[PDB]
Structure 1
Amino acid sequence: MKLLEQIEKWAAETPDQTAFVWRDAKITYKQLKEDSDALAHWISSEYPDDRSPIMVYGHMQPEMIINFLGCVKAGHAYIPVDLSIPADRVQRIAENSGAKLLLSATAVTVTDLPVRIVSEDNLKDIFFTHKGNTPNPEHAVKGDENFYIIYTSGPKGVQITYNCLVSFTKWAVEDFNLQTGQVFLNQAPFSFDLSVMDIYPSLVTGGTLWAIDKDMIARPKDLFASLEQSDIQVWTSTPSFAEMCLMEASFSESMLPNMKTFLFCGEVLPNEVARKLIERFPKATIMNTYGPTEATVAVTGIHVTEEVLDQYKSLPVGYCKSDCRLLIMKEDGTIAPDGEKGEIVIVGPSVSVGYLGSPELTEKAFTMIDGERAYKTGDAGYVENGLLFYNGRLDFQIKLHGYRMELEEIEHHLRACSYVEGAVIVPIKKGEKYDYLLAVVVPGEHSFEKEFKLTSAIKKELNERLPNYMIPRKFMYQSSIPMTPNGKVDRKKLLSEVTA
């Protein structure tokens, strides 16, 4: 029943099954409950009637998960902080959030923070000192109490409650057709809510989380060696991450014979990427999902079949979970007729209760409609018979020749051209106005003897897809597209190197 109870069920039924593994470090469900219980018991003894959020610092160590559960068992929401988050932002989070404690298995490198730091051996000592102890079942986070708080770079703390997470997880477990005892890949740092899509569905279904870290990602040979040993069955990642893995010829069914489900969220999933996955993994089901962190990971989802790939050049993002609903709003706070583009607004139990301590910010994006919470995504899109389509971020809309064009739509067409394997549009601005567009593309196999031949071929094909003023003036070619630590296109890095 209760989220924690459905997880703990596996501690009793399959105590020795691995719950989380990172390189050679692993922990069973039995161990997870034990240490988590010990930590919650300790938290409860150190902060008797306190329920302040607790920071959990690290990368992919099993302790990250132990600490998450320990925090909620004592009634505290946790704040995931990845090692890749700049110290400056960590310092802010420590102050924006009334957190009084930070937990980390590894050494904390961020300059003195206004919180009690429990790390390294000090964390080990609580697992030992409180070994065998159990917390008051009644202290566990429940109802509309915060379960976790994830900050959205920008930096505001999105508060996700117990009800919010239960609403997402139940839907994920049912509609993503997960089973039990499956191996789940974890690619996203815990500071990115995409990780929630694999963490909880895995735990409630007695699965095994197989973590891949930053260093491994940097060393392809290590990365691919890990996947080969993983036996991963449920793959949760950003589209960019899968695309990079796709650059390796051995990334196929042969490497992951028991692959059964691909779950994507966070960015546009190119029709081309899905096609390649079906070819490489004819036994796997591909799911595209959409949603902002402010709406608890994702609210829409759709099975990307051959038929879907056939009728939608640009893949839809899915049907809204049944306990929530969508609204497409145009120019004014008026609702748009189905088919018309407008700003995507989400309403239902998946919507966050708001940004932590940010009144003005919450008032601008969060609203109440018929008694329930609503959230303006800032995303442009439309619906057709319950199916939601994503056009792009309003903030990314470029204007040239008095014409407005979603940046993402231009990338869609560039990506669709022959000889293009990966591509990003970098707008070059001359002040407040757009000067011209620069296309960064990863060339596919070709026989062009000189660069201009390739650029000419792409511009000609692109001329059949876009108005001339939408076609990028300059092209740059490179073997790969950079990703941020979260696994998304590093647009800022690209703008930087093109500017210079």
Structure 2
Amino acid sequence: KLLEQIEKWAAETPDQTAFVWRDAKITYKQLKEDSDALAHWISSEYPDDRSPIMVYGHMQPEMIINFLGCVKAGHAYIPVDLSIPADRVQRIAENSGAKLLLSATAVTVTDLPVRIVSEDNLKDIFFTHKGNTPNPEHAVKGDENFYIIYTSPKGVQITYNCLVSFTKWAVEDFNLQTGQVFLNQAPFSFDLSVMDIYPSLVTGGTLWAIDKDMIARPKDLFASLEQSDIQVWTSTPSFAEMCLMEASFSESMLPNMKTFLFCGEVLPNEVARKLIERFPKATIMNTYGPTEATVAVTGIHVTEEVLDQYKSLPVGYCKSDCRLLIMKEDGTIAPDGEKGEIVIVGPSVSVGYLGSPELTEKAFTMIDGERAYKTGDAGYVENGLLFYNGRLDFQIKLHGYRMELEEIEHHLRACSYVEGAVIVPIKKGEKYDYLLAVVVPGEHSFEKEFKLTSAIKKELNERLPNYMIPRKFMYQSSIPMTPNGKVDRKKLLSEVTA
């Protein structure tokens, strides 16, 4: 079914661009053909095997061809971005039980206990098996693994049913039409990319990829953006914020922008507001979910009304085929409006971590016959609406006082003269010593740094208790992002600590 709705475009709109990265692009017809040849090759080489297959690279069109080739042959694929550390890739190879690794580019990771098919060798199978097609019944189905994406060091197994459950909801609730241009910011090793990959493929859209190098060089990023004619924007809030630092990043640069889809981090009320101002015709959606629950399970249309009544934006209503549970600090459920750990239950929940029995036991459970996943996230529900408070382990306790790190960040972000901010907790060694605020200053006329600091501290005093107000402030032109596009908190902690 999933592959069928995708294949449907190879016949209806064969010459439509299915994926484009810089100068490299492939049509739906080419996607089908090479994908079919690979699948045929896989089946000929591994007749009665269904071991997961590693797919190595970055944004090359072959990444997508290889993903489909793998599933058509009944093999789940393991996306491995170039950014993943060698030691990690080696662990994945050994943990996953993979026997093969496919890459369009050169594999730089020191010898892996896997058969490597790369560069020209991959090209050879496309040529060698050109025209051939795989047995329709070999295609991954039902509860069989479709892809395995690693988090933290655990392989989250996402089944066919999991992905279909997500995709259907995404296409319908995000109001995606057909033939639209979908931005792809997230590396394939990050499940945010799934939010644009499959919805685009099933709706005959065009995936417009952006790579790590464009990001390292904004002039190229924006150049690409203007040529893209992107209509559906899928990215982390941080990525959007960085683009917002560019005055030309607006409806003028992307006049056909229609839908913004956010997930992965807190979407600031101010960021959404800036996007509405810059793109008055675009719809903004905030969504929430762990990789363990197939990309996202909640979503909400962030309107002017939502922005007016929710200083802290809610993360959304749970998809209809799943449900949420807010667990009080005890096996007990919490009354609506009360904070607890967010638990997700339903067909979106992963079947567990690959080869990690003990790890699966600790985070996954069975409730009334269905899978449930403890997120490690703190939040609450109010009449179906889910609110995110922060990561349970980011819960800082300052001298006899608890507090979500994210709540302090939320208020810091809301202060005048602040365009971006992150709190770096400085620990004495065991307990929390003090908080350090890293902010990107907005326009101001403060002639001395301490004056800006005092001003923000005064405003923050009206929002938080004195003991939650960061003692130290640091200013910089931008907040670092990890290769996935999220705030790089480790890097920040590393440099501010040094």
The answer to whether the superposition gives a TM-score over 0.5 is yes
> Shift of the alpha carbon at 1:378?
0.3
CA–CA distance in structure 1, aligned partners of residues 14 and 218 of structure 2: 34
Secondary structure of the corresponding residue to residue 90 of structure 2? helix
Report the CA distance between 1:284 and its aligned residue: 0.2
CA distance in 2, matches of 1:452, 1:366: 48
Partner of 1:36: 35
- CA deviation string 1:92-141 (max 9, x = no partner): 00000110000000000000000000000000000000000000000000
SS of the equivalent of 1:350 reads coil
Alpha-carbon distance in structure 2 between the residues aligned to 1:318 and 1:41: 42
- In the aligned structure 2, how far is the partner of 1:28 from the partner of 1:104? 20
CA offsets, 1:168-212, max 9 Å, x none?
Answer: 000000000000000000000000000000000000000000000
Name the CA distance, whole Å, in 1 between partners of 2:497 and 2:258: 43
SS of equivalent to 1:108: coil
Aligned residue number for residue 102 of structure 1: 101
Q: Give the distance between the partners of 1:214 and 1:46, measured in 2 at CA.
A: 34
Corresponding residue for 2:341? 343
Partners of 1:379 and 1:105 lie apart in 2 by 37
**Deviation sequence 1:274-311 (CA, Å, 0-9, x none):** 00000000000000000000000000000000000000
1:314-367, Cα deviation, whole Å (9 max, x unpaired): 000000000000000001100000000000000000000000000000000000
For 1:496, what is the secondary structure of its paired residue?
Answer: helix
- SS of 1:323's partner is coil
2:303 paired with 1:297: no
Give the C-alpha shift of residue 374 in structure 1. 0.2
Matched residues in 2 for 1:138 and 1:452: separation? 68
Distance (Å, rounded) in 2 between the aligned partners of 1:120 and 1:434: 50
Offset of residue 468 of structure 1: 0.3
**Where has structure 1 moved over 4 Å in runs of 4 or more?**
none
Structure 1 Cα separation of the partners of residues 268 and 89 of structure 2: 34
**CA shift digits 1:133-174 (9 cap, x unpaired):** 000000000000000000003x00000000000000000000
Q: Equivalents in 2 of 1:374, 1:444: separation in Å?
A: 43
SS of the aligned residue for 1:56 comes to strand
Secondary structure at 1:278's aligned position in 2? helix
Distance 2:417 2:456 in 1: 8
SS in 2 for 1:66: helix
Deviation at 1:266, TM superposition (A): 0.1
Q: Distance in 2 between matches of 1:213 and 1:369?
A: 41
The corresponding residue for 2:138 is 139
Shift of 1:401: 2.0
CA distance in 2 between partners of 1:316 and 1:402 (Å)? 29
Q: TM-score, normalised by structure 1?
A: 0.99
Distance across 2 between alignment mates of 1:489 and 1:439: 14
Q: Separation in 2 of the partners of 1:316 and 1:276?
A: 18
- For the residue of structure 2 that corresponds to 1:11, the secondary structure is helix
Aligned-pair distance for 1:37? 0.1
Alpha-carbon distance in structure 1 between the residues aligned to 2:452 and 2:40: 64
| Percent identity between the two aligned chains | 100
Which whole-Å CA distance do the structure 1 matches of 2:363 and 2:277 have between them?
A: 41
The Cα shift of 1:17 comes to 0.2
CA shift, 1:255, in A, is 0.2
**Distance (Å, rounded) in 2 between the aligned partners of 1:350 and 1:118:** 32
Residues 395-414 of structure 1, C-alpha deviation per residue, up to 9 Å, x if partnerless? 10000121110000000000
For residue 486 of structure 1, give the secondary structure of its aligned residue in structure 2: coil
Per the alignment, in what secondary structure is the counterpart of residue 263 of structure 1? strand
Superposition deviation, residue 432 in structure 1:
1.1
Q: Separation in 1 of the partners of 2:463 and 2:78?
A: 45
Distance in 2, matches of 1:419 and 1:45, equals: 62
Superposed CA deviations along residues 396-451 of structure 1, whole A, max 9, x for unmatched, are 00001211100000000000000000000000000110000000000000000000
Q: Helix, strand or coil for the counterpart of 2:321?
A: coil
SS of corresponding position for 1:410: helix
Which residue of 1 is the match for residue 78 of structure 2?
79
Aligned residue for 2:8, secondary structure, equals: helix
State the distance in 1 between where 2:312 and 2:329 align.
24
CA distance in 1, matches of 2:497, 2:202: 47
d(CA) in 2 for partners of 1:216 and 1:414? 30
Q: Using the alignment, how far apart are the partners of 1:385 and 1:11 within structure 2? A: 43
For structure 1, list consecutive stretches of 5 or more residues without a partner in the other structure. Answer: none
Between the aligned partners of 2:383 and 2:329, the Cα distance in structure 1 is 22
User: What secondary structure is seen at the aligned counterpart in 2 of 1:245?
Assistant: helix
SS in 1 for 2:25: strand
Distance 1:229 1:398 in 2: 45
Shift of 1:466: 0.3
Task: Give the whole-Å Cα distance in 2 for the aligned partners of 1:224 and 1:43.
Answer: 39
Q: 2:427 aligns with which of 400, 405, 429?
A: 429
Q: Please give the alpha-carbon distance, in whole angstroms, between the structure 2 residues aligned to 1:146 and 1:220.
A: 37
State the distance in 2 between where 1:383 and 1:259 align: 31
For residues 437 and 320 of structure 1, what CA distance do their matches in structure 2 show? 34
The separation in 1 between residues aligned to 2:69 and 2:420, in whole angstroms, is 42
Measured in 2, the distance between the counterparts of 1:80 and 1:467 equals 45
- Return the alpha-carbon distance in structure 2 between the equivalents of residues 430 and 214 of structure 1: 36
- 1:479 — aligned with what? 477
Q: In the alignment, what sits opposite 2:167?
A: 169
Q: Structure 1 CA distance, aligned partners of 2:48 and 2:430?
A: 52
Q: Which of the numbers 251, 254, 260 marks the counterpart of 1:253?
A: 251
Correspondence for 2:312 among 311, 314, 319: 314
Partner Cα distance (2:443, 2:324) in 1? 42
Counterpart of 2:141 in 1: which secondary structure? coil
Find the aligned partners of 1:450 and 1:385 in 2 and give their Cα distance: 47
Superposed CA deviations along residues 242-267 of structure 1, whole A, max 9, x for unmatched, are 00000000000000000000000000
- Measure, in 1, the Cα distance between the counterparts of 2:408 and 2:429: 21
Give distance in 2, aligned partners of 1:81 and 1:421.
Answer: 33
Distance 1:187 1:386 in 2: 30
1:236 aligns to what SS in structure 2? Answer: strand
**Aligned equivalent of 2:209:** 211
Distance in 2 between residues matched to 1:234 and 1:473, nearest whole Å: 41
SS at match of 1:475: strand
Give secondary structure in 2 for the equivalent of 1:273.
helix
Counterpart Cα distance in 2 of 1:67 and 1:218: 27
- 1:365-380 aligned within 5 A: 365-380=363-378
Summarize deviations over 1:371-402 as a string: whole Å, max 9, x none.
Answer: 00000000000000000000000010000121
